[PDB]
Amino acid sequence: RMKQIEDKLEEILSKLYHIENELARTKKLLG
Amino acid sequence: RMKQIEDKLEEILSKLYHIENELARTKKLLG
Amino acid sequence: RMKQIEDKLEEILSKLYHIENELARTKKLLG
Amino acid sequence: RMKQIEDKLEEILSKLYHIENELARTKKLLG
């Protein structure tokens, strides 16, 4: 199923945004 | 081929969970 | 739906290039 | 095409390994 693929894509993308949000912080803790 | 795409999907997910965790020890050690 | 899957693919790729670059300034600033 | 999807998956995965390799370093620069 293609919808299944898309869906796992959506979740894959989610994780990258969260990963982007923990770099923002790590960047900040290091001023 | 879907069993493939499907495998690589979870493989992709599994490494984003590892990367998320790697970044999560850095950011605490940093704290 | 393929145009979707295909979009989200490049969207996924584009953020991994950003994350790679974020991590790349950290690691030099660190140096 | 499914093969196209797979292929972008392969490259997506590539980037995550490289991303794993620049955390290894950033981790090390911070002892």
One-letter amino acid identity for C7? D
DSSP letter at B1? -
Chains contacting chain D through 3 or more C-beta pairs under 8 A:
B, C
Chain C residues whose beta carbon lies within 8 Å of the beta carbon of residue A28: none
Half-sphere exposure of D28 (CA within 13 A, CB side): 7
User: Which ranges constitute the DSSP H helices of A1-31?
Assistant: 3-29
> Beta-carbon neighbour count of residue B20 at 10 Å?
14
DSSP letter at D30? T
Question: Which method was it determined by?
Answer: X-ray
Closest CA in chain C for residue D12: C13
**What residue spans define the domains of chain B?**
1-31
Q: What is the resolution of this structure in A?
A: 2.5
Task: Give chain C's largest Cα–Cα span.
Answer: 45
User: Locate tokens 């993308």: which residue?
Assistant: A13
Nearest to C12 by CA among B5, B2, B13, B18: B13
